[PDB]
Structure formats: C-alpha cells, structure tokens
C-alpha cells in the first residue's frame, strides 16, 4: 500500500458520488411530478363569459403577430384604443413602521449582532455621486464590525467556506463505506481522528488532549500508522485539490463527526468533603440569578464574544464566602439559646438495630453531603427529614447513614470584625442623608455610575481593604443587598427608608424626607419595612386602589400598573404614531415604563447605521446608564411608550430608577392630562432634528373605553381603526416565544447534563413568568412550584436530586427560609404517599 | 402523440402605452391567470403595470394573422401608489372574480373586475407590499410580503370582515424588506425571502371560523437559512416539497430541499420552531433527521442549478413553473438581456434512462451499439443487426450536432464528443453546482428585462411581462392551419 495507490482507489470510489446524485435528483423529480396538485375551488360556470372586447380616459395597446422557429414578427403593428375604468380608493394606509412591534412585560437581554447582508436603499447609477455615497457607507459599516476586534471574515472566503462546507456534507456519508471497501489496516475513522489530533495545527493543544483522552494515543503497529498517514495525504490529493472551489480536507470531514465535534463546542456554562459539594452545586452557583432566581434570564453581562456572565454566586466568590458567613451567623445565634409523615427522630432513632437496608449509591451519599453542608450549624432545620423526602428513603435511614459516615463540618473562626465609625454624610442607623452627601457620593447619579460586582472581601469596606463600592468609582457608593458585608459592620450598607404615614408616604415632595426618593430609587420590599412596600410592590396587589391610596408611593415600576393609553396618529406633521391618554392622569402619577432590548453603546450605533438611511432617521434607543453604556432599544420589543413623541414643554418626564439592582426608565406626569390628549416629553440633548460612536438617542435629565379625539386611533396588534366609545383594547402580554428562547438557550449548553437541563428548564419555565426582583416573594413562589410540580418531582430520581441542589444553593444564600424547607418536605412525602396509593 | 414533448413558441406581443410618466420607467410587474374558472373555459389573465390592471381573454385561432388576445377590462388605480404585486380571489358570497393589487403605499386593493368596482381594501402593513400570493387550499386566504419586513395573512371570509388579518409572521426571522412570498399546496406552509438574504419556511395554524380580535403572531420560522444563496433572494417557490429560488448576480434558479421536510407528515406547532441561540449558525431547522454519524447533520441539500444567464445586477425577476396533473412540468423564466428560457422537467428522467441503457450496452457489446429513435420494435431493430450488436431506444426529441464517444465521424456506432457534451449540458443532473442549459431559449426584439411568468390552466399559453409595459404571449398546441 502507498499514497499514490490509495488515491487511485478513492478516485474510482468517488465516481459513485455523481452517479448517486443523478439517481436522487431524478427520483425526487419524478415523485413531485406524480404528486402534481389537482386544481380546486372551481366555479360551476365561466364567470368572465359575459364580457367582450373593450376596443373618459383612453390608452394605447399595439399588437404584433409572430411565426416560425426564430419567431419572426409578421409586421402588423395594429393599435386599438381602450376605455379606462378609474377606481379611486376609500381607505388610507396606516402610519409607517418596521418589524412586528411585540410587547414585553420587562426589559429583555439582547445579543451583539453582525451585518450578514447588503442593505439596499435604492438604485445607484454606474460611476455617479449617488453610487459613491452608497458604496462609502457600506465600507463604513464594515468598519463597525471590525472596530470590535472580532472575526473579520471577508466575503471572498465566506462564499469559499460555504461552498467547502456543502462539499463536506456531500462526502461525509461516503467515508465509512469507502474505508470499509478498502479494508486497510489502521484506516478506521477513529484511527484517522487519532492521526488528526497527533499530526499538525488548527486545534488547541488543550482540545488535542481532550480528543486524545476520549480516544487513545494508541494506533500501533508502526506500519498501521504509516497507512493512516498515507490515507490522509491520498484523500487530500483527490478531494483537497488547492486549485478547486469544491475542495475539502479529510480533517474537515472528521471535524463534523458526532464523536469529535463536541470537543470544539465554545458554548460552556461552568476540606475534601466541601470540595465535593462545590463541584456538585456548580451549575446552580454559576447560572442561577441572584435577582430573578432563573438560570436563563435578562440579567448578566454579554461579553464582546456574545458569552454570558450571569448575575450568580460566582460573581460574589461562589458558594464558600456566602456559606462561611451563614455558618458564622448560625454559631453566633447559638450563644443566645417537629414531626413528619414518613417517621422522624423523636419516634424512631436509626430504625431497627438489625433491619435489612438496600445499599446507597454515590448519588444518594452526595445528596446527604451537600444538604448537611448548606443547612450546617442550624438550630431548627434538620437535613434528614428533607433528604428523606428527596431520596424517598425512610427518615431513620438518613440518621443511620449520617452516623455511619460521621459528618463533621469545617469550623468557623470568630469573625468579630472591629467597630468602624459612621460616614459623615450617611446615617445607616437613623436611615437618612446629611451634609454634602450629593457631592460626597454618586449612588443617586445613575448617568455617571459604572457597574461592578458587589463586594465579597472578608475585611472592612474601605479603600485600604479594596472595597469597590468605596474605591472603584470616582466617589464611594452605598453597599447594596448582594454585598457580603452586613449592616452592623459596614457603614456603607443601605438599610432602606424609615418612612411611615397613615396617609401616603415615600413621596417626591415631603417633615423628614424619604431616602429612597432622594437616592433616585424605589423601595426594597425587604429593607423598606413599615413604609410599607412589602404589600404594595407585590404585582398581585397591583389593582387594590385602597392599598395604594396610602403608604409607599415609591413602588410604581414594581406594581407594574400603567395608566390606560391608546395608540394613534400623531398631531405633529409627518410623525406617524403618537401615544394618547385613554384616561385622566393627574400630576405626579406614573404613566408608563420604557421597555426594550438591553444593548451596549456599541450595539446601538451598529443597529442605527444598519437600519438608517444616507439619502434621508427613526430611533427607539433610550439611554439607561450613560457611563456603563447600557441602552434600551424598543424597535421590535417593548411597549406603547415606544410611540411617545418629542416636545420641549411635554406633559410627562422620564427618570432612571434603581429598582432592586435593575436600572429602569419611568415616565411621570409633569402636567394634568385629560383623555384624548397626546403624550410628549423632552427627548434630551442627544437626539438631533425635532420640530413641532454617534447614535440618535433619547435621554433623561441629569373596564375602559376609546377616548374622544380629532386624530385616528389604532389597535396595536390588528392595526384596525378604533372608533370612540368602543371598549379600549387591553391585550395580555404573550411570553411563550420568550419562554421558548430561554428553554432552548439552556438546551444548547454543552457542559449541562440532560438530567440537569430537565430541572433547570422546568424551574425557569415557571419562575421567568413571575418576574421576581425581590427575595421577599421567592418563598411564596417557591411553595407554589413545590406544590404544582409535586407529582412531577417524585416521579424521577434525577428530579429530586436536582431540586435539592437548587434548595441547597438558596439555603446557603440565606434567601430561602427554614420553615419553607420543612413545608416542602411535607408536600413531597404526601406526593409520594399518593404515588404508591395508585401505581 | 409526440405533442406532449413540444415547448412554447412566440405568438402575440403587445406594447401597452407608458402609464407611469413621472421623471422610474413604466413596467409590467405581474402577470396572473384566473385559476377558479371551469375546465375548458377560455383563459383570462391580469397584467399589472405601475398604475393599471389589464384583463385579457385568450382564444385559440386557426389563422396565424389573427390576435387571440382581447382586453375585456382595463382599470386605473387612481392614487399615488406604484403597484407591483397581484393575486386572484373569489367573492365569498357571490363567487365573482376578485383581483388583489398592492404597491409602494402598503394597502391591498381588492377589485370586482366583472363589475368594474372596488370590493375592499386591506390596511395594516407599515411599508410598501412587494408580493401577493393566494392559498391553494383556500381562495379567501392572501399572503402579503412588505418592506416592513413582515408577512400578513388575510381572510376575505365574511367571518373576517371587521378584522381581516388572521396572522402575522414577525419576530426577528427577517431584518430587511421582503421580496417574495410563496405558498405550499397544503396552504399550511409559507416561504418568505428578501433583501436580508434569508429564506424562511413557516407553518401556519388553523384559523377559527369566527371573528379574530387580534391576529396570531408567529415569532420563529420552522426552517431558516441564508446559506443557499450569497445574494438577495427575489423569487422563491415550492415544487412539491422541493424548493426553487433565485438571487441577484448568480445567473441560476436553484432547486434544493429541506432535509427531513415532508408535507405528508403532521404540521408542527409554534413551540416546535427553532429559535436562534448560536448566532455563529446561519441555518436552523425543525425537520432535521435525528439519524447521522455527523454531530451537525445537513439541514438542506442543493440538487440542481437551472442556468439562467445574463441577469447581472438585475433583481425583481420571477420564474413560474407549470405543474398540472397529467402534463409535463415546465419551468419558464426571462432574463435581463432579451431571452425567454424553458425547461421540460420530464426530459431529465428520459435522458437519465437513455444514458444508463447506452452505458450498459457499450460495456456488454464492446461499443458495438446502434441507437434507434421511438417511431420499429426493440426486438425488430435487434433482428436487423442480429446478436452481437446492442440496440438502445433513444427519445425522438434527443438531437445530435461515462459513455464513450465514436472514434472517427464515419463510425457506425456512437455519437460525437460534441453531441454528447451538448446533451449533458441540457439534461445532466450529477452536479449540484452544475449549470443546466435551457431546453428552449427564445430571443426577444429590443431591450427587455423579464418580470413575471404565467401559464394558462391547460399549459397552452405562456405570458411573460417586462420593461416598457410589454407582454410576450407564447403558444403551445396551436390550432393554426
């Protein structure tokens, strides 16, 4: 056997490929011919029959006749005059738009996009100013894709790759039967892949190790390796001819093999006893949101390479710092100082001294390990009851196994951090701002704020210890809920508002003011007690007019109830749509939130020059955080606020608000608005032409019926013209497509095992619907999940194990109470108590 | 007998006067035959210029100096709209013909052609409409493709009067102005294409026979790919479950297919559709077969490229296939350099079999093969040359000028390399990236850019329309004496 002889055999085996294609094509062509559609919906009589030749406006038609093979015109240019029937239209078109405008409840995260086509503005004359204006514009759009320092692939090779990939798809099935026919010693796909990793370089030496870990390095005898080395060279001589367009190296075929391709994925998510726990909870600690509790959400950073860095425990040191502090809090509370369905401890010890017990597997001992660690130095909560409900095993088995392995925690050092003095501008104890606070800090100034991970250091929150809250910015910023520092040890820790009133409190204009209002932020349902946001901020209590008539007036965005509004034709000259009031809006009332896609300053300019015109302009970009460079694009996704027009003396006004570590845009009434009136706001000094790196962007300063109006009003979906007096349409937000988007994202993760994905997709499907933003409502919504999916959870081994990992992470975080764990214990054993009752 | 093999020849050609006289030029953008008339009825078609609708009746004549065409109706859309899209429909109550016309304003105008009145107007699209298509499954369903990058599905049914828009194909599936919309015969699948270079296949739900407060929005297609063509797609169509499409600067009409797609399987739900997770992937499909040795199984397959030369930078040129049970399938298309092309798809299969037999005979008889046309028996021809001479039957329409060519021209066996090559160039299908030469390529007098093609229900008439308000009528199975 030799390279020249192998390449000869391949050439004859290759002539199978074009004779096989011909067979296929002809086969499908005969098949479609046979299945030709029989014409339907035929009228019983000829409907045109009555009509005769028409030979008041009149138009010319000159006829000509042809004969023979070349179709030579038998010159008879005979023209007849025909009467025209002028049909003027009764209906006017709607104002213009681009894309289907869909409604999103809250802002959704978006991926940075590239231009993969040629935007055609209009017909340009060859060698003219119009051509030079258009061609220079496309070269400037190529410069935006290149500015990112990204994978700048020229169209010359895009077309070439496309072509090569198509050929690789063609030959791939042929490889195994061809190899099988040749029957060469050492010429097996696995061995050819073995040779691929070994002989260079288009693979990472790290990826090379992985491929050689899956397969071996073993491919001996030394003549068998000669054969594999010969075949690769022989194949490239036949199918990888460098002078050809339909070209493909053997390397490229092996690269798409099912056992090869999952090594080159680029879609990755992620005390010896403790180490095991850390690895076991990995997925939950890495993807699980600290804000909304989802493993796929609209929170987290999208890096230039479109990879997500979630707002998870890994952002604040992972499991260990958050948990070490829990144990410390637990051993300190210890100084001051329940029965279930399937047995317990007060009734049964380790069960019977000599009772036959089935052997526990590695997965079962694992569930005992991580649950004991996350509960730790507890007083009330005991793992055995819950692990019992999870593993299905009787409660006394978890006592027996716990004694068998003798579980001992790591100890926690006395973390009695010395006393620090209070800040000259902020009293965390009396909950108020004093002195030159507005100059001292930048917490309230969102336009100049730069996002950073909450501080997770063990020392004090100063510049010397390296606290970012205090040192990273131009000025210090108040420590928020996700900082590991506590209120008794750190003077920067935000503690909420001391606000309370029999009437309305936490108002824009007040004896002593509301710190939340002053800090340009809504009230925290947890920290802002007795104000009393815990009840009002809850969207389930959103239409309770007697609840909102008093108390916390600062939870407008959190209640998510917007004043009734209508879409219509704007009063302004050539403006298209405008938003109109459907009800009466009094001064100082929350109208609507500006929702859209969360994009970078960079992505915003990319979209602007992609969609925009040089021969011109419409923009739905709103700045959320000027410094960090986060913008809100309402071009496709958002709400009716996307249609509000510009006017210097508007009736409403936008304000960036900190809403539980979520920056949000709110519109408040700066005038008294009557129904049928057009809503307006001053767009800011960043939008150009407005008459009654550079991107046109709007900024901020740093039951019912169709109303009576002169202008036409349209339904946002159907675009049908609504007539006054009719019931005002209120279409509920359909999230299904967005839930689908999130389920699939998780499914596309390589380093997520099928068992993990199943629970993660089920938890997220459920939780993304509740739009949780405060930990204050997680217990409620957790109990609803453990109740609704109770039967689903008991039915599988993996589901219980996965569910416990989620429960462990939330416990370690001190975000899930003890009482909620035992209530979940009771609903799971009752769900399993009904599985045996009928199974 | 051999009449099934004939292809059209130029008959009548009319130059309608300039209707768009604003200094851009007046052109005929859409030709469509009425599909609901009973069998045998003289074919009636509509021709759409920038501001007019010409309605003609064609009747076969015995005299070669007579004009079969008769303009029975001529309408003028009195507006500022420059029309280009058109489709036929029926009055849901009276069953009288309806003609849909859309242009650069964004409204679909339904005309009661027989009475010369306006039936209704379909409002909602936020840009100009470029293509209109009627559901083969339901004559009241209309699909419109607009510059607003969306597709609106409309129902002319009495239950859908207040709100005629039954469906919206939106989401992020398309990013720029749409140029083509096509229907599957089942009326459940829709093809869409345009400037963004993406070809999308959508599955429509079942629409209730009641009032719809809001249309059903479809966020994702069931198949989406921008990798079939490297340029803007202006014409897309279904041919069975197979796809035909064309792009600018490519000189081809591509016959390809979605791997795993069969209209014989159940229509997938909206939540079965592939969502775009990995952006570094320009093709996604619900249909993809699960069985494969490759981690990435091919989602589509390029089958054949119909060579349609001299188009260049010209776009908004549409092909039309004649596909009726019992007759041959004929693909017709006119280029930007005054030529009308024809392909009889029944020819490939016959050639394939002819060549396969010829190859087999050449091997079995060592090149001593005699080929005799159909019009003499095989066992009759075999007796003339006896045993030791192979005899292959050649389809009559195969004309001269892996299979070995004759050595010298006086040789009793085989065809010239030039004859075989000429044949291969028109009927060979072994190369997905090959160029199939037109089976009939008819020239046109003066500068002509083809826009739309239309076949008469019995495939006896082929009307091609284009620049300078022109229409070229081609005839087959003539009555001329």
């Amino acid at each position: 056997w030799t390279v020249d002889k192998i390449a000869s055999a391949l050439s004859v085996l290759a002539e199978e490929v074009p004779q096989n294609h011909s067979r296929l094509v002809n086969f499908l062509l005969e098949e479609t011919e046979k299945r030709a559609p029989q014409p339907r919906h035929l009228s019983k009589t000829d409907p045109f029959a009555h009509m005769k030749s028409k030979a008041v406006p009149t138009m010319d038609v000159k006829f000509k006749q042809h004969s023979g093979e070349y179709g030579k015109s038998r010159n008879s240019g005979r023209r007849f005059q025909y009467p025209v029937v002028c049909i003027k239209p009764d209906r006017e078109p709607v104002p213009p738009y681009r894309f289907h405008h869909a409604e999103i409840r809250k802002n959704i995260l978006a991926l940075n996009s590239q231009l993969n086509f040629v935007p055609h503005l209009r017909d340009v004359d060859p060698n003219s100013a119009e051509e030079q204006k258009y061609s220079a514009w496309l070269m400037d759009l190529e410069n935006l894709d290149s500015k990112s320092g990204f994978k700048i692939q020229p169209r010359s090779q895009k077309i070439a790759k496309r072509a090569q990939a198509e050929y690789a798809a063609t030959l791939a099935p042929y490889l195994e039967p061809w190899l099988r026919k040749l029957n060469i010693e050492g010429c097996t796909k696995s061995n050819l892949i073995r040779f691929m990793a070994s002989q260079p370089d288009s693979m990472t030496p790290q990826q090379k190790s992985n491929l050689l870990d899956t397969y071996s390095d073993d491919m001996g005898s030394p003549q068998a390796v000669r054969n594999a080395s010969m075949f690769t060279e022989a194949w490239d001589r036949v199918f990888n001819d460098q002078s050809k367009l339909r070209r493909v190296a053997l390397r490229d075929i092996l690269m798409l093999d099912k056992n090869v391709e999952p090594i080159f994925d680029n879609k990755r998510a992620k005390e010896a006893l403790m180490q095991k726990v850390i690895d076991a909870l990995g997925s939950y600690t890495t993807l699980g949101c600290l804000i909304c509790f989802s493993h796929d959400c609209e929170h987290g950073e999208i890096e230039r390479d479109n990879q997500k860095r979630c707002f998870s425990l890994e952002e604040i040191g992972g499991l260990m710092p958050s948990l070490r502090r829990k144990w410390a809090a637990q051993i300190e509370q210890r100084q001051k100082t329940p029965p279930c369905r399937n047995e317990c401890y007060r009734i049964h010890g380790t069960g019977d001294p000599n009772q036959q017990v089935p052997p526990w597997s590695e997965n079962e001992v694992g569930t005992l390990e991580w649950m004991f660690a996350t509960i730790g130095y507890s007083q009330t909560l005991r793992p055995e009851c819950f692990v019992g409900a999870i593993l299905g095993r009787p409660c006394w088995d978890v006592h027996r196994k716990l004694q068998e392995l003798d579980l001992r925690l790591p100890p926690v050092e006395p973390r009695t951090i010395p006393k620090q003095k209070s800040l000259p501008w902020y009293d965390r104890r009396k909950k108020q701002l004093m002195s030159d606070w507005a100059d001292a800090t930048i917490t309230h100034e969102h336009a100049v704020r730069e996002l950073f991970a909450p501080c997770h250091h063990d020392g004090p929150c100063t510049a010397a210890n390296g606290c970012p809250c205090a040192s990273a910015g131009t000025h210090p910023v108040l420590c928020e809920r996700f900082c590991l520092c506590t209120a008794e040890e750190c003077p920067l820790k935000f503690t909420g508002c001391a606000c309370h009133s029999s009437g309305k409190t936490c108002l824009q204009r007040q004896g002593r003011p509301c710190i939340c209002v002053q800090l340009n932020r809504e009230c925290d349902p947890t920290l802002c007690k007795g104000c009393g946001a815990r009840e009002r901020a809850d969207p389930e209590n959103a239409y309770d007019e007697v609840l909102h008539s008093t108390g916390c007036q600062n939870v407008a965005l959190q209640r998510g109830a917007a004043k009734a509004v209508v879409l219509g034709k704007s009063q302004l000259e050539a403006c298209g749509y405008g938003l109109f009031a459907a009800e009466d809006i009094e001064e100082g009332e929350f109208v609507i939130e500006y929702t859209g896609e969360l994009i970078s300053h960079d992505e915003g300019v990319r979209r602007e020059h992609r969609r925009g015109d040089v021969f011109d302009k419409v923009s739905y970009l709103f700045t959320l955080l000027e410094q960090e460079g986060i913008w809100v694009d309402a071009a496709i996704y958002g709400n009716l606020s996307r249609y509000i027009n510009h006017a210097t003396d508007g009736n409403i006004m936008p304000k960036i608000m900190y809403v539980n570590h979520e920056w949000r845009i709110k519109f408040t009434a700066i005038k008294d608005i009557k129904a049928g009136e057009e809503l307006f706001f001053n767009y800011g000094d960043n939008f150009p032409n407005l008459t009654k790196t550079k991107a046109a962007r709007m900024s901020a300063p740093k039951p019912l019926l169709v109303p009576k109006t002169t202008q036409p009003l349209f339904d946002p979906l159907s675009k049908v013209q609504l007539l006054p007096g009719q019931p005002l349409p209120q279409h509920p937000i359909d999230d299904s497509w967005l839930l689908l988007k999130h389920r699939d994202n998780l499914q596309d993760f390589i380093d997520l095992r099928p068992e993990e994905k199943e629970f993660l997709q089920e938890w997220d499907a459920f939780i993304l619907r509740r739009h949780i933003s405060s930990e204050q409502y997680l217990p409620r919504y957790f109990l609803r999940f453990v109740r609704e999916k109770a039967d689903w959870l008991v039915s599988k081994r993996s589901r219980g194990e996965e569910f416990s990992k989620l429960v462990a992470t939330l416990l370690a975080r001190r975000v899930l109470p003890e009482r909620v764990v035992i209530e979940a214990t009771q609903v799971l054993n009752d769900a399993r108590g009904r599985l045996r009752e009928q199974g | 007998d051999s009449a099934e093999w004939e292809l059209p020849r130029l008959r009548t050609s009319f130059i309608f006067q300039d209707d768009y006289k604003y200094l851009d030029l007046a052109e005929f953008f859409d030709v469509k035959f009425y599909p609901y008339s009973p069998p045998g009825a003289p074919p009636v078609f509509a021709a759409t210029s920038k501001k007019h609708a010409v309605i003609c009746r064609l009747t076969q004549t015995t005299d070669k100096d007579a004009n079969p065409c008769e303009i029975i109706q001529l309408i003028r859309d009195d507006g500022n709209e420059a029309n280009c899209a058109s489709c036929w429909s029926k009055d849901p109550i009276t069953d009288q013909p309806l003609l849909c016309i859309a242009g650069n304003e964004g409204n679909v105008k339904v005309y009661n052609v027989t009475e010369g009145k306006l039936y209704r107007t379909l409002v909602g699209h936020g840009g100009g409409i470029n293509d209109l298509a009627t559901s083969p499954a339901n004559p009241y369903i209309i699909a419109s493709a607009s510059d607003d990058t969306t597709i609106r599905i409309w129902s002319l049914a009495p239950e859908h009067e207040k709100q005629p828009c039954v469906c919206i194909l939106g989401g992020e599936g398309h990013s720029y102005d749409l140029l083509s919309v096509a229907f599957h015969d089942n009326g459940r699948y829709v093809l869409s294409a345009g400037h963004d270079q993406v070809i999308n296949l959508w599955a429509l739900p079942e629409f209730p026979n009641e009032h719809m407060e809001i249309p059903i929005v479809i966020y994702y297609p069931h198949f989406s790919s921008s990798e079939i063509h490297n340029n803007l797609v202006d014409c897309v169509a279904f041919y069975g479950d197979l796809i035909l499409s064309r792009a600018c600067h490519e000189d081809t009409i591509v016959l390809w297919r979605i791997e795993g797609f069969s209209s014989d399987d159940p229509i997938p739900g909206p939540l079965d559709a592939p969502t775009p997770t990995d952006m570094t992937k320009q093709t996604r499909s619900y249909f993809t077969p699960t069985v494969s040795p490759q981690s990435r199984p091919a989602m589509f397959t390029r089958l054949a490229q119909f060579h349609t030369p001299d188009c260049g930078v010209q776009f908004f040129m549409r092909f039309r296939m004649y596909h009726v049970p019992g007759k041959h399938p004929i693909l017709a298309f006119a280029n930007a350099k005054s030529k009308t092309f024809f392909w009889d798809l029944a020819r490939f299969g016959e050639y394939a079999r002819f060549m396969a037999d010829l190859k087999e005979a050449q091997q079995s008889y060592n090149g001593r093969v005699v080929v005799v046309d159909q019009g003499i028996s095989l066992a009759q021809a075999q007796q003339v040359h006896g045993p030791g001479v192979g005899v292959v039957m050649k389809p009559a329409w195969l004309v001269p000028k892996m299979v070995s060519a004759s050595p010298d021209p006086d040789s009793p066996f085989g065809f010239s390399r030039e004859t075989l090559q000429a044949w291969a160039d028109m009927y060979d299908l072994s190369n997905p990236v090959g160029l199939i030469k037109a089976h009939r390529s008819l020239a046109i007098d003066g500068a002509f850019v083809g826009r739309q093609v239309g076949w008469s229900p019995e495939g006896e008439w082929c009307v091609v329309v284009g620049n300078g308000n022109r229409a070229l009528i081609y005839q087959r199975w003539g009555k001329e004496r």
Binding site: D123, V124 | H249, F315, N467
Partner: peptide, 8 residues
C-alpha cells in the same frame, strides 16, 4: 452593486 429598474 444591485439594481431593480431596467435601463432606458
């Protein structure tokens, strides 16, 4: 570069 209308 692309063109939709025919040159006269």
């Amino acid at each position: 570069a692309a063109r939709k209308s025919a040159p006269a």
